[PDB]
mmCIF file of C-alpha atoms and ligand atoms in Angstrom:
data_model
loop_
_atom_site.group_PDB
_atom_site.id
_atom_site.type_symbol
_atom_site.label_atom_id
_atom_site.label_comp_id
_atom_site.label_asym_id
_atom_site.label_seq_id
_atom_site.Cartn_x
_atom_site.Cartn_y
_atom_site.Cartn_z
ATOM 1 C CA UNK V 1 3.429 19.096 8.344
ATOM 2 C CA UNK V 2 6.489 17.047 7.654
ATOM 3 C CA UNK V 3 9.069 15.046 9.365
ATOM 4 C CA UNK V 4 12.123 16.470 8.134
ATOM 5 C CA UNK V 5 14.916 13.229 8.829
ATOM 6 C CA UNK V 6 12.222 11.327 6.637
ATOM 7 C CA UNK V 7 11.876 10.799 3.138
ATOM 8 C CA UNK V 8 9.513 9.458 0.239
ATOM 9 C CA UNK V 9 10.227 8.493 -3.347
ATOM 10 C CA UNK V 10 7.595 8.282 -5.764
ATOM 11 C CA UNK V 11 8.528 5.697 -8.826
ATOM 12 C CA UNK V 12 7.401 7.578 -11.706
ATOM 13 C CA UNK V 13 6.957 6.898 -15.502
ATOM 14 C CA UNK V 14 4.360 5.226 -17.665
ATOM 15 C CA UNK V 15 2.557 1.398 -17.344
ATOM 16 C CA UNK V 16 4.418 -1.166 -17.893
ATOM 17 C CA UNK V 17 8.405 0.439 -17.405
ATOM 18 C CA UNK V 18 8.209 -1.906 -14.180
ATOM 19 C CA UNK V 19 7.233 0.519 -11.229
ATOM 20 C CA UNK V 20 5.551 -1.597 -8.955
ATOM 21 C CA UNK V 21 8.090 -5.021 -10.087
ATOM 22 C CA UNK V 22 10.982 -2.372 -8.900
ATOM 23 C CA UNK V 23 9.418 -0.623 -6.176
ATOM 24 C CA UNK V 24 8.507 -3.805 -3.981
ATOM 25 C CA UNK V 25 11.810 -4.768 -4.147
ATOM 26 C CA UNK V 26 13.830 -1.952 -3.428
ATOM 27 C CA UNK V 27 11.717 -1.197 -0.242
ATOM 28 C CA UNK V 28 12.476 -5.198 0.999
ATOM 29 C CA UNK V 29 16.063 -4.700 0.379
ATOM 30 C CA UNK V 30 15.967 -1.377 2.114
ATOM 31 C CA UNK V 31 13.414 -2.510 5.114
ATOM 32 C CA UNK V 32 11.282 0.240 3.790
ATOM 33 C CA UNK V 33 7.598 1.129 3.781
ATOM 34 C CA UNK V 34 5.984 0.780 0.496
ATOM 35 C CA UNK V 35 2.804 2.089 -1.423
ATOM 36 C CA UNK V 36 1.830 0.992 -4.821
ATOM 37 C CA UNK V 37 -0.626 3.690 -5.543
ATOM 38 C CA UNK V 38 -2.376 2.039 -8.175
ATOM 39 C CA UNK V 39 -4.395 0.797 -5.485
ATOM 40 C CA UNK V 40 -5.604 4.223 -4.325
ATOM 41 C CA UNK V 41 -7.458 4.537 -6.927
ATOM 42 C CA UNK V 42 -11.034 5.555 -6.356
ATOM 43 C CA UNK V 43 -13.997 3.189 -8.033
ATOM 44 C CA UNK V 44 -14.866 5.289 -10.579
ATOM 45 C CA UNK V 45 -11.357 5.312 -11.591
ATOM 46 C CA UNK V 46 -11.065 1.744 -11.460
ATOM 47 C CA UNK V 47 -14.311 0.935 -13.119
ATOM 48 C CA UNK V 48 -13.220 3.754 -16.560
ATOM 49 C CA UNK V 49 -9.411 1.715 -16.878
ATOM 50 C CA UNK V 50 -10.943 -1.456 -17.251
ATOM 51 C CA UNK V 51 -13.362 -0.389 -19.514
ATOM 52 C CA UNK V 52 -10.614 0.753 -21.715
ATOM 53 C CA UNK V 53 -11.210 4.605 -21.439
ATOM 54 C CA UNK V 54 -7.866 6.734 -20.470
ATOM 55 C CA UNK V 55 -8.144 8.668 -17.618
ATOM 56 C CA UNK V 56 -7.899 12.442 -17.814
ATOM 57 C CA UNK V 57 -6.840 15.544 -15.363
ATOM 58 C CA UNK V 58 -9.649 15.572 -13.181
ATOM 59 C CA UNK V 59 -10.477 11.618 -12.761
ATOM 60 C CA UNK V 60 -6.525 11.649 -11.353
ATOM 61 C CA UNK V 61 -7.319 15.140 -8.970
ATOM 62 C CA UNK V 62 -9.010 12.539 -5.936
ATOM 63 C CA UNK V 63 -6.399 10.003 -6.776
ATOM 64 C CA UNK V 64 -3.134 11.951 -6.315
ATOM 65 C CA UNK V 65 -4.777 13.645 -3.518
ATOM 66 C CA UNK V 66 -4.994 10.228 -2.392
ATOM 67 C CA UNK V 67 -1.572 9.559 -2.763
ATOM 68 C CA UNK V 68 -0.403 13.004 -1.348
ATOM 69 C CA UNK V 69 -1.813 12.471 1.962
ATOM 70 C CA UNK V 70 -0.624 8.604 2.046
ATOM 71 C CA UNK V 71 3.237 9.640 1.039
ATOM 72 C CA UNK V 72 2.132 12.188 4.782
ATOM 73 C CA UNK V 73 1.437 9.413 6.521
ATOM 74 C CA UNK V 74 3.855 7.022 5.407
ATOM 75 C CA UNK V 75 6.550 9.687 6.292
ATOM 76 C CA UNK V 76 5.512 9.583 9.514
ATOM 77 C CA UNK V 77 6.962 6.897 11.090
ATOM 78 C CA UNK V 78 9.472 5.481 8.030
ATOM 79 C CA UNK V 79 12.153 7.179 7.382
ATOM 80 C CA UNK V 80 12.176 6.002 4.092
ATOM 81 C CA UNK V 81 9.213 5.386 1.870
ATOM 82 C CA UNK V 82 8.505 4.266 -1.461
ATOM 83 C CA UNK V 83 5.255 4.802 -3.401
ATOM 84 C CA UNK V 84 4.782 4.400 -7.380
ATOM 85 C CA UNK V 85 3.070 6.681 -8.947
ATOM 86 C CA UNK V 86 3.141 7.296 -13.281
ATOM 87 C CA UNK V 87 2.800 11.091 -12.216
ATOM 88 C CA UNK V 88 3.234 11.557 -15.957
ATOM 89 C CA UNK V 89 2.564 15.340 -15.413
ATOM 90 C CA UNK V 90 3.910 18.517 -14.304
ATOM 91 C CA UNK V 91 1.195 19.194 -12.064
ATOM 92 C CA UNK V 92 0.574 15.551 -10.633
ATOM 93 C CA UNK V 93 3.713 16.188 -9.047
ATOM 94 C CA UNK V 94 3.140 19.334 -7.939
ATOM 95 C CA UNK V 95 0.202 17.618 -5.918
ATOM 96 C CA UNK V 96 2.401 14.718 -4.851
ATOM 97 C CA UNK V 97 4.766 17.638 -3.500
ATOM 98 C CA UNK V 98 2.145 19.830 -1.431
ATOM 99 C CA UNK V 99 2.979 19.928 2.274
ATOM 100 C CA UNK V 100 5.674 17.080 1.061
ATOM 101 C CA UNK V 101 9.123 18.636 0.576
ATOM 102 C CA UNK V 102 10.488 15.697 1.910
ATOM 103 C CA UNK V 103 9.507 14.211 -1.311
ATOM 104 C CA UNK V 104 11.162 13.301 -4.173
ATOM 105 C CA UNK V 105 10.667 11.417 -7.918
ATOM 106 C CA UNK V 106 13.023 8.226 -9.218
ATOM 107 C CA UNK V 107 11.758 8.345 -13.201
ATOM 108 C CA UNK V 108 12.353 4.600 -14.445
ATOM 109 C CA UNK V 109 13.035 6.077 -17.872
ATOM 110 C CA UNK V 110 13.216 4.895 -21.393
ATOM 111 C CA UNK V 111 11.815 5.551 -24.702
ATOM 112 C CA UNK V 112 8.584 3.792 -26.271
ATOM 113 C CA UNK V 113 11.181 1.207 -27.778
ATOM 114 C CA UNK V 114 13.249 0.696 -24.893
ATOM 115 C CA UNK V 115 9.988 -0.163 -22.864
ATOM 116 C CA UNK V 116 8.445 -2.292 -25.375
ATOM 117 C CA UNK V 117 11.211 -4.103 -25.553
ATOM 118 C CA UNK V 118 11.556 -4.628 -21.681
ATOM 119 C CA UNK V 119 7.595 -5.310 -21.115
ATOM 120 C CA UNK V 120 6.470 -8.521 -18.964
ATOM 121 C CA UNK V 121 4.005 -9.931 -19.772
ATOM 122 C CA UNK V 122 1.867 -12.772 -18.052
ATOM 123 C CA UNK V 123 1.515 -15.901 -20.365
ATOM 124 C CA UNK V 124 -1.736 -15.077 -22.550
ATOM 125 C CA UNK V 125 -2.128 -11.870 -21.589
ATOM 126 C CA UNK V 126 -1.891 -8.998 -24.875
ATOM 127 C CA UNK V 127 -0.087 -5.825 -23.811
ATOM 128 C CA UNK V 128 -1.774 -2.600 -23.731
ATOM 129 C CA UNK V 129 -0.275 -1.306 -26.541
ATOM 130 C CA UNK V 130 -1.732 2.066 -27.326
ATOM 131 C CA UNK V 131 -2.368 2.237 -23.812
ATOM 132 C CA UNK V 132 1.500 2.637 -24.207
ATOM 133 C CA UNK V 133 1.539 5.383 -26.903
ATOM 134 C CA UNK V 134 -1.182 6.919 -24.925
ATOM 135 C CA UNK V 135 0.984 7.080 -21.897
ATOM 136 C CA UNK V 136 4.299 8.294 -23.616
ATOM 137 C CA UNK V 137 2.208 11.274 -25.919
ATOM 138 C CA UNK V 138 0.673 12.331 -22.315
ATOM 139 C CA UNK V 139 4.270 11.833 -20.299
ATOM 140 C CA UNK V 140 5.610 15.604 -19.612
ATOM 141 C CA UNK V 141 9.526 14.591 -18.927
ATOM 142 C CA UNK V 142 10.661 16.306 -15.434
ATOM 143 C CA UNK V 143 12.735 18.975 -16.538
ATOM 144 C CA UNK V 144 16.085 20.409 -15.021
ATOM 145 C CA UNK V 145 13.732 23.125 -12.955
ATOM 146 C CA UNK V 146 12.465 19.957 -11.015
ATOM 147 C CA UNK V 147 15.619 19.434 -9.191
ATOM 148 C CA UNK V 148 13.946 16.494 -6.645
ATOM 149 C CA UNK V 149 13.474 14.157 -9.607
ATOM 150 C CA UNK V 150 16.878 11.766 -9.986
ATOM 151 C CA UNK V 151 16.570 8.987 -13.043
ATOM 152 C CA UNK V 152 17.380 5.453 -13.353
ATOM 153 C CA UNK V 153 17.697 3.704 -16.864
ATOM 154 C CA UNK V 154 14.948 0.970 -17.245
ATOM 155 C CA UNK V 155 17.334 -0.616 -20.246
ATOM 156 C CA UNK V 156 18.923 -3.027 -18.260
ATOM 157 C CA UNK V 157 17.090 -6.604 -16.392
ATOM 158 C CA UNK V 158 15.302 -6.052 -13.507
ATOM 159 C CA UNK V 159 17.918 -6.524 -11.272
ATOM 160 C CA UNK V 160 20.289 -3.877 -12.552
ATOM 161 C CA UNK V 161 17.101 -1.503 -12.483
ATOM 162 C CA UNK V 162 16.258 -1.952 -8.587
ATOM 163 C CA UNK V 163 20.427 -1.664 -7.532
ATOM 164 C CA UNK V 164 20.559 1.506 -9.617
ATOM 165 C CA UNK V 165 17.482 2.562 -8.089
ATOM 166 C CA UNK V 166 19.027 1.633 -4.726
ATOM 167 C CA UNK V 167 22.103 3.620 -5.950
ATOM 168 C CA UNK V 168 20.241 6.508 -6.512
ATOM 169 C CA UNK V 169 18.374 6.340 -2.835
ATOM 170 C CA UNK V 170 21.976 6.109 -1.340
ATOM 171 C CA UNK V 171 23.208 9.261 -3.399
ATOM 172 C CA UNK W 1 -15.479 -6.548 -11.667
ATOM 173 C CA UNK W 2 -14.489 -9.624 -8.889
ATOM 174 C CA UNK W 3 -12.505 -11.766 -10.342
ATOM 175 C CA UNK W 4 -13.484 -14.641 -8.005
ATOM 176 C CA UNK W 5 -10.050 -16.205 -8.973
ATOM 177 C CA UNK W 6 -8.174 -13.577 -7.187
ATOM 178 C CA UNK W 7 -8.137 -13.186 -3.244
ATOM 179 C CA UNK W 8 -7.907 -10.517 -0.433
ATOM 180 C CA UNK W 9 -6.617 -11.303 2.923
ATOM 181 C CA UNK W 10 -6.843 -8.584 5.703
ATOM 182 C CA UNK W 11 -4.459 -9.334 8.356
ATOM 183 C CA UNK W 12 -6.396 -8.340 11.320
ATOM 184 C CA UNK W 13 -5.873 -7.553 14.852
ATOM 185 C CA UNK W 14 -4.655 -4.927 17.770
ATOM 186 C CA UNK W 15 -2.157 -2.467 17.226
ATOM 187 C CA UNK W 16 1.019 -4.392 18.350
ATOM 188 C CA UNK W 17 0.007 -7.979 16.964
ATOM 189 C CA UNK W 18 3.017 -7.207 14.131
ATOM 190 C CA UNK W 19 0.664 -7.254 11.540
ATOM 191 C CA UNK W 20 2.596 -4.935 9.081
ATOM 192 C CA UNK W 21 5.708 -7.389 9.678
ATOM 193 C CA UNK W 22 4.318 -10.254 9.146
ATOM 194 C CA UNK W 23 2.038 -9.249 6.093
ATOM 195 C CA UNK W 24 5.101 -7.493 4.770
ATOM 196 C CA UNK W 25 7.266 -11.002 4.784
ATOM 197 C CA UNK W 26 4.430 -12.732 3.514
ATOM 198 C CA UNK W 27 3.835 -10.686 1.252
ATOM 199 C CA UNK W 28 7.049 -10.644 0.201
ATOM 200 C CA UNK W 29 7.333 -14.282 -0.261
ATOM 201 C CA UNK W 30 4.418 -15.146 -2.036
ATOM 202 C CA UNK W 31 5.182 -12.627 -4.187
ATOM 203 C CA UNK W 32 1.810 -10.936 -3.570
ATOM 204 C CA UNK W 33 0.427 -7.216 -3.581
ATOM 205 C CA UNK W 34 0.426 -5.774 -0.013
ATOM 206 C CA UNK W 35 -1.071 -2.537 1.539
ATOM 207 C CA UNK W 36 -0.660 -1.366 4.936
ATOM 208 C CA UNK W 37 -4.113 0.069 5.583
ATOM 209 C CA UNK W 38 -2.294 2.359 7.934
ATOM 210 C CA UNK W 39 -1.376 4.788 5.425
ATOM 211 C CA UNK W 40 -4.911 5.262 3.845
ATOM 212 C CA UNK W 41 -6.341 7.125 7.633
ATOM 213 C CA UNK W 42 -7.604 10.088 6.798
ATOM 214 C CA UNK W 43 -5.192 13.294 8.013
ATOM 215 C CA UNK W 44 -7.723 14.113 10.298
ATOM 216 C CA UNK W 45 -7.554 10.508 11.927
ATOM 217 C CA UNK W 46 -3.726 10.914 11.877
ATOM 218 C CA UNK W 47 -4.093 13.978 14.101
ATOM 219 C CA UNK W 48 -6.624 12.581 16.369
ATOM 220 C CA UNK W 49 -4.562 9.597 17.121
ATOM 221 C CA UNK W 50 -1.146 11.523 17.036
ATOM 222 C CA UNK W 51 -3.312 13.710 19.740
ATOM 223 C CA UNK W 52 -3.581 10.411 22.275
ATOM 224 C CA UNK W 53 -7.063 9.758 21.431
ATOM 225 C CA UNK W 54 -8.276 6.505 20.269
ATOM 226 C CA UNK W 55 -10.741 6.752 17.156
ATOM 227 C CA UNK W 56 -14.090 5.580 17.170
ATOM 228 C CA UNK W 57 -16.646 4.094 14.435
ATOM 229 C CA UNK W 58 -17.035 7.337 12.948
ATOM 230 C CA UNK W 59 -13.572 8.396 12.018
ATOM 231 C CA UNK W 60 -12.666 4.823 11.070
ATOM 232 C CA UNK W 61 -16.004 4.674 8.508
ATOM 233 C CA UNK W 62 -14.058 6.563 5.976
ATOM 234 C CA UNK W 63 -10.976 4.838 6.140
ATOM 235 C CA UNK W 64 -12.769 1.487 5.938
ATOM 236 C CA UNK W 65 -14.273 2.543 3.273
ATOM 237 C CA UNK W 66 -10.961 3.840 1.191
ATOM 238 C CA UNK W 67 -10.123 -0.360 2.301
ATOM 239 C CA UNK W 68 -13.100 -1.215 0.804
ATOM 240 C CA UNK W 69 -12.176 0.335 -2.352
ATOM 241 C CA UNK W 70 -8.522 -0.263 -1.950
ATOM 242 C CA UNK W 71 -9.438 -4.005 -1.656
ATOM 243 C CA UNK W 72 -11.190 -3.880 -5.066
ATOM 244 C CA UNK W 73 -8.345 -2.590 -6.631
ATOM 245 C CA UNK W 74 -5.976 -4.795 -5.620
ATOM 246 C CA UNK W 75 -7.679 -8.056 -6.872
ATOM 247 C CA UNK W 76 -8.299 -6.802 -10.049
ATOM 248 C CA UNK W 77 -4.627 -7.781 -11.187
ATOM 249 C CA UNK W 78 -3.626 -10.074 -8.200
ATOM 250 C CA UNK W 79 -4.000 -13.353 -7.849
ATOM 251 C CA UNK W 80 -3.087 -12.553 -4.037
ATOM 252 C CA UNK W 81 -3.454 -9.289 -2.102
ATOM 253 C CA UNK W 82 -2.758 -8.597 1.498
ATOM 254 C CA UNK W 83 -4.007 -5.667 3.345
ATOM 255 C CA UNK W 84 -3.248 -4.467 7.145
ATOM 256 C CA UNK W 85 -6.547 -3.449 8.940
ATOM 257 C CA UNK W 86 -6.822 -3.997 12.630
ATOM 258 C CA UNK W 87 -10.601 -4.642 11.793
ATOM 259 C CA UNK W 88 -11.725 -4.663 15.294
ATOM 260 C CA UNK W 89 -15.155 -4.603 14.842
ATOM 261 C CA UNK W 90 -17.575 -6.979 13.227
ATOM 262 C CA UNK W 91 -19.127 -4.367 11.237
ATOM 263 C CA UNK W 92 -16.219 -2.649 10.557
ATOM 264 C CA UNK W 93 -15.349 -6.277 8.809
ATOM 265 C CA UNK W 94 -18.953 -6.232 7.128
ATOM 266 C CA UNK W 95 -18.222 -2.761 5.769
ATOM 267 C CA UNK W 96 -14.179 -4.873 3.984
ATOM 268 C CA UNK W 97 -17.131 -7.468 2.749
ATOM 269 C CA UNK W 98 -19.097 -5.357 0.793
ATOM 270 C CA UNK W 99 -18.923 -6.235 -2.729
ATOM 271 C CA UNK W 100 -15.730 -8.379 -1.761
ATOM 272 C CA UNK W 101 -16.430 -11.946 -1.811
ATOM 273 C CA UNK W 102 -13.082 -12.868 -2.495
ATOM 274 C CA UNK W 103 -12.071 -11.138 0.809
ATOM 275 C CA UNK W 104 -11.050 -12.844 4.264
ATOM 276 C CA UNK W 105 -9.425 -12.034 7.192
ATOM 277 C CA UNK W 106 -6.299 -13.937 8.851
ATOM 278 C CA UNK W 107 -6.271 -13.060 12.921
ATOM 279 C CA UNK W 108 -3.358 -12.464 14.189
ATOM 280 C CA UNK W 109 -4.158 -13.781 17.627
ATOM 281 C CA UNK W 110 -2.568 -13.243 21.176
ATOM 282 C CA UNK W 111 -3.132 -12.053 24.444
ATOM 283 C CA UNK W 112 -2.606 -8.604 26.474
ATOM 284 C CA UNK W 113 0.246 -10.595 28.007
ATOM 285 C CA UNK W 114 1.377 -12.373 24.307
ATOM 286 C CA UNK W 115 1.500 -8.579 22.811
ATOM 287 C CA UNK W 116 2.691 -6.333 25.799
ATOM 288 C CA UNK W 117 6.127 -9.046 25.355
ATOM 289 C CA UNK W 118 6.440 -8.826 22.018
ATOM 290 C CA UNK W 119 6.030 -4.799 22.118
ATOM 291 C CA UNK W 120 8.714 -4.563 24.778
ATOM 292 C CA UNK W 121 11.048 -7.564 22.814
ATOM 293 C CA UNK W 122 12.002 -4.460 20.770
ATOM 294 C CA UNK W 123 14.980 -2.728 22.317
ATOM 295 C CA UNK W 124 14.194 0.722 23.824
ATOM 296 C CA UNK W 125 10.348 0.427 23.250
ATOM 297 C CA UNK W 126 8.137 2.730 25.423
ATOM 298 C CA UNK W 127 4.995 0.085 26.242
ATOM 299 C CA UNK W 128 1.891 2.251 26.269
ATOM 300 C CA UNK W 129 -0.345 0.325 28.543
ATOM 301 C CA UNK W 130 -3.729 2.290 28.343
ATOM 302 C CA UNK W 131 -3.637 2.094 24.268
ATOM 303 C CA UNK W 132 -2.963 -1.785 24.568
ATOM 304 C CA UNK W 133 -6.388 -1.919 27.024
ATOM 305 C CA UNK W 134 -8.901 0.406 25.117
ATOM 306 C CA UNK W 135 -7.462 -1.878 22.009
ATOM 307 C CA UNK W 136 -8.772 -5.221 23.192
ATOM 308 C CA UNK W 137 -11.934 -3.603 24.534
ATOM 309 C CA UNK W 138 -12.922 -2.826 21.014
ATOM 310 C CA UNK W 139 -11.541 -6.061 20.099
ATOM 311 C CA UNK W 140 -14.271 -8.281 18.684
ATOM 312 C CA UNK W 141 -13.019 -11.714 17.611
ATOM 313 C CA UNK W 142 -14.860 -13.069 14.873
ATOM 314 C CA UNK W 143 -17.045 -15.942 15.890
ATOM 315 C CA UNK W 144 -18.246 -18.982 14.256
ATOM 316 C CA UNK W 145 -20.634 -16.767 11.966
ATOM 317 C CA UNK W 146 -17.612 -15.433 10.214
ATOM 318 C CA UNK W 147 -16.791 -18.555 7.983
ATOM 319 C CA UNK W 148 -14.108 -16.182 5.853
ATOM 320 C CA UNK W 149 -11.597 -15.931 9.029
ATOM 321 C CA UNK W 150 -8.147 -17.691 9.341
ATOM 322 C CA UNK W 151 -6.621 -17.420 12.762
ATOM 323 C CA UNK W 152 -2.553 -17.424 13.660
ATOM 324 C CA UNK W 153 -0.911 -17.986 16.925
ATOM 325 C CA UNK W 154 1.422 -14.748 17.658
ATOM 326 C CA UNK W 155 3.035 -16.685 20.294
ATOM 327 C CA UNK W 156 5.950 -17.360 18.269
ATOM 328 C CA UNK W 157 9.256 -15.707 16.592
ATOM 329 C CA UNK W 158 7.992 -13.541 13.462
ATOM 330 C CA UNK W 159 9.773 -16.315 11.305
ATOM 331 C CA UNK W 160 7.020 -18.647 12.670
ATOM 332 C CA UNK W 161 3.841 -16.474 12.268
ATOM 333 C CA UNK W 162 4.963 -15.914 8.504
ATOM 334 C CA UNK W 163 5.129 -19.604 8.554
ATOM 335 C CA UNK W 164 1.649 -19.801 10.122
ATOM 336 C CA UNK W 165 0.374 -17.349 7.980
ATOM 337 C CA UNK W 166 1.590 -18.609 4.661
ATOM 338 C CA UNK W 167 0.198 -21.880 5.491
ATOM 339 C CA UNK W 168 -3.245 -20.980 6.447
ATOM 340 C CA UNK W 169 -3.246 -19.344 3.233
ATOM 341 C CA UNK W 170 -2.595 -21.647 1.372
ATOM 342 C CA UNK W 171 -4.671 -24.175 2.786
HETATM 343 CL CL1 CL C 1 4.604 0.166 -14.303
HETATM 344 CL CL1 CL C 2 0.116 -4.161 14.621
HETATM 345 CL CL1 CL C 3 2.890 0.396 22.623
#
């Protein structure tokens, strides 16, 4: 079940590299549809990130499942589609891809001191810090074998981030 | 959990009312979080409807209720959040509500006559007449009991509704 002259990119990589800032913008530019699937998440998902406790494998299972059957509908009336998504693992993106090979990853990438040092943050608020080093220890890189995943370089103002991503969607 | 500072407007109405436009562009321009509910049906609701059949209380429970949730998540870190839901139904508006105080609903209000012109403004558009009908039969417009509802003239360019809309929220 896919429409095959569609497509969907997922915005990948960990809190706070500027998925959602990136994302929203890109898809105006572009006139497409866009998901920010931080939003999927279910209650109990919700409820544990607040509280301060990481999320593991199987609280994310019902989320990217979620997400994999939004990116289906999304794709079927936009021919393109964005959705963010940390998919920080292997297998998260395996179950973004299921029934989705019209799907593909942009990784806003950049190591822990590259994204510290581009973190924005609202006046008074204290970043999630080892939230950070949390993310980045459980971050599995995409590999060459994962030949749908194309990279844009989050070292660089916002601006430069969302025409490179642009760039990349052109490509 | 509510953060009573934050709001959730549905934009609300029949298929064809342009509520994903407009909510998009206002979105856009208030710089808020937007979801098109539309991408959160259920695959089985995707079928049904992709089948000809309208869906009834039953199939839409779920997806209200993935709303519901949605809803929550997006006013936990936005001041503003906009989310597409025809919300037809009183009850299918009760069911938004629950445990979302800090959720209204802007109307995006017009006329089989208003809607049917605005479908067919769109070059090359096939007008399905029978959808449009069963669509305002399940239409319930949200009486003076419903103190939470904003309502917008559609009988305007789209540059003018996002005016509309803006300004009734930020009344
Ligand atoms: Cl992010
Ligand atoms: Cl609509
Ligand atoms: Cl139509």
């Amino acid at each position: 079940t896919t429409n095959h002259d569609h497509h969907i990119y997922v915005l990948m990589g960990v809190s706070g590299s500027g998925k959602s800032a990136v994302a929203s913008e890109v898809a105006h530019q572009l006139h497409a549809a866009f998901l920010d699937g931080d939003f999927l998440h279910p209650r109990r998902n919700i409820e544990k990130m607040a509280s301060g406790e990481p999320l593991n494998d199987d609280d994310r299972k019902p989320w990217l499942q979620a997400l994999n059957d939004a990116a289906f509908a999304m794709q079927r009336t936009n021919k393109v589609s964005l959705i963010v998504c940390s998919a920080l693992k292997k297998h998260y993106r395996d179950l973004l891809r299921e029934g989705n090979p019209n799907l593909s990853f942009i990784y806003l990438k950049g190591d822990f001191d590259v994204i510290e040092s581009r973190l924005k943050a609202r006046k008074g608020h204290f970043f999630k810090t080892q939230m950070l080093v949390t993310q980045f220890e459980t971050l599995q890189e995409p590999g060459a074998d994962e030949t749908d995943v194309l990279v844009v370089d989050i070292d660089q103002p916002l601006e430069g981030v969302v025409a490179s991503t642009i760039e990349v969607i052109k490509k």
